[PDB]
Amino acid sequence: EAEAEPLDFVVATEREFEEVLAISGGIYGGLDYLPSRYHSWLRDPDRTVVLAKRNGGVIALESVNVIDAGETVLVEGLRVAPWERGKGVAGLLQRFCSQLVKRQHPGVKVARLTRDDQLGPRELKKYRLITKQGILLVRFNASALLAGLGARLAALRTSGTFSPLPTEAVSEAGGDVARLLLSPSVQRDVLPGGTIIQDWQPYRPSESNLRLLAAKGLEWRVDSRARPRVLTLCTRPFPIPHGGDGTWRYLNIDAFGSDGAQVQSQLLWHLQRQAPRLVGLNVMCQLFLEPQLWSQLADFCQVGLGLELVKGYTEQYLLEADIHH
Ligand SMILES: NC(=[NH2+])NCCC[C@H](N)C(=O)O
Numbered sequence: 001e002a003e004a005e006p007l008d009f010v011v012a013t014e015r016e017f018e019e020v021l022a023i024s025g026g027i028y029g030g031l032d033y034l035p036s037r038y039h040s041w042l043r044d045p046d047r048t049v050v051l052a053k054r055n056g057g058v059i060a061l062e063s064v065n066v067i068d069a070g071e072t073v074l075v076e077g078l079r080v081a082p083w084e085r086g087k088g089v090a091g092l093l094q095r096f097c098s099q100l101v102k103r104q105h106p107g108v109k110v111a112r113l114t115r116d117d118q119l120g121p122r123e124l125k126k127y128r129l130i131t132k133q134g135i136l137l138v139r140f141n142a143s144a145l146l147a148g149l150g151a152r153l154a155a156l157r158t159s160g161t162f163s164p165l166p167t168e169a170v171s172e173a174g175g176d177v178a179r180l181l182l183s184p185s186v187q188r189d190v191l192p193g194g195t196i197i198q199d200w201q202p203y204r205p206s207e208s209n210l211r212l213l214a215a216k217g218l219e220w221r222v223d224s225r226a227r228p229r230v231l232t233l234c235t236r237p238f239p240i241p242h243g244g245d246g247t248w249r250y251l252n253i254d255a256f257g258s259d260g261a262q263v264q265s266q267l268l269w270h271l272q273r274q275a276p277r278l279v280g281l282n283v284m285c286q287l288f289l290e291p292q293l294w295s296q297l298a299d300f301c302q303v304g305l306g307l308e309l310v311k312g313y314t315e316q317y318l319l320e321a322d323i324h325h
Contacts (some may be wrong), residue, residue, distance in 0.1 A: 005055035005274045009096045012049035012061065014042060019058035020051070030242030031250055031284055033199075034061075034077055037238070041077075048100060052080075053091045054262055059084045060093045064100065067212065068204040069108040073323070076201070102325050112320050119317055127319035130202070131193025133254075134294040135314045136287040138307040142278035145271070145305075152177070152306060153268075162304055165265040170220035172230075177213075177220055181205045186228050190256045195318060197288065199235040199252040202318050207237035221269050223262040230257030232266040236280060248282045254291040260296040263289055267297065268305070 012020070017038055024032055034041075041049050041063060052060035060080040064073050073099070080089045101108055116135060119127075156162035170176040183290055189193045196203040196216065203209040217236040217263050223229050235252040242248040253270055257262045267287060275283075285307070289297060292314055301307040 001148060003054060007059075007092060008056075010051055011054060012038075012042065012051050014039060016051060016058050020061055023058060023060070025082065027079060030248070031240050031286070033238065033240065033250065034079075035239070036242055042301045048097075048104075049077075049098070050093065050097050052089060052096075053166075054084070060089050062093050063298070064097050064099050066101075066105050066108060067209060069206060069208045070105065071109050072204070073105065073108045073111050074201060075113045076112055082139070085136045098323070102323060106325070108323055110320050110322055112202055112318065114197070114202065115317050115319065116314050119319075120271055127321045130318040130320050131286040132291070132318065133195075133197065134146055134291040134295060135287065135316050136298055136301065137314075138285050138287075138301050138309040139283065139310050140285065140307050141282050142275045143280060145278070146275050146309075147190045148306065149272070150302065152185075152304070154230050162300070163263055164268055165223075167224050167262070167265055167269055167275070168225050169256065170222050172218075172220070176225060178207065178210055180225070180228055181210060182207065182221065183228070186231070190228060190231055192251070192256060192290070193318065196233075197254050197318065198233055198315070199254070202255060219270065219273060221266045223259065223266070226315070230259045230262035230266060231269060232256070232263065234270045235273060237274060237283065240284065242284060243282065245279075248284060249278055249281050251278075251285045253285065253287045254287060255287060255293075257291055258293070260293045262306075263293055263297060264300050267300075271305075284310065291315065 013022055020038060021035060024034060041047055044065060047063060049063045051058045062078045063076040066073055067070040076091060181196060182205060191205060198213060219234045221232045233254040237249040237251045240250045241249050251274055253267060287297060299308060302309055
């Protein structure tokens with residue numbers, strides 16, 4: 001029962017946007033970023049979005065983007081249509097893209113990717129684990145959160161439960177981001193495996209990548225610019241298909257450091273910064289933090305901030321594998 005027409009690998013364009021959506025049903029439980037990101041991906045100068053087509057119909061997608069000053073290729077968004085899964089399509093698409101990178105980007109030495117699924121033996125054999133972070137996913141209505149937070153945080157103050165610790169501002173334009181991330185000691189003691197993870201995307205801490213990060217509208221927060229120990233990072237919210245009513249946004253916060261109290265205070269700062277912009281909308285807030293801090297922050301979010309836990313503990317894995325020219 002051979003397929004009548006063969007597989008054709010071609011670079012994605014804006015015309016296939018609706019075809020790509022048709023194969024993306026239920027991806028990441030409705031937290032899929034590609035609906036909101038597909039068009040920007042096409043404008044990225046170091047990125048190649050590859051579609052697998054059978055008889056002219058899109059059935060799979062993979063993106064490869066060269067970062068880390070040309071030494072790394074990040075693999076994102078790998079997906080196959082539900083009705084084409086289990087036939088090795090994702091494997092064939094992976095091989096086409098690996099050859100493309102080796103051909104166009106001879107300087108790439110490693111491939112990198114992030115994932116939340118359990119790392120089976122296969123993974124451990126083909127990939128090195130650079131680092132891993134815990135994942136805390138909560139949901140809330142922005143308006144309801146704002147209307148009740150003052151009372152919530154006042155109770156904590158008087159209750160003696162919690163009082164927000166001081167935090168310090170971080171300005172990219174002012175040069176604070178560079179002075180933090182280019183610090184060898186911050187890279188060693190703060191960053192997970194010496195790596196910046198921003199909305200599932202890993203970057204080596206380098207000026208070249210800092211330029212990429214600066215163009216995304218990220219917001220930073222730190223415990224002390226002089227004595228940095230906890231550094232948090234918020235990605236600008238964007239729409240996700242969850243809910244089907246178009247009201248849901250994905251708020252990604254990456255937390256680097258081992259002081260749980262500072263991760264709490266800095267998470268609260270980001271929430272008070274971002275929720276006003278989300279009035280009238282619903283938010284899926286995913287916090288990535290050191291695994292040992294998870295229970296502390298899940299409680300804080302649940303009991304302290306009246307937030308709803310969407311799912312139990314899971315982990316984000318940063319994987320790396322060499323490129324075999
Ligand atoms: N909820 C998740 N599992 N998100 C995974 C995002 C990262 C994934 N490797 C991608 O580029 O699509």
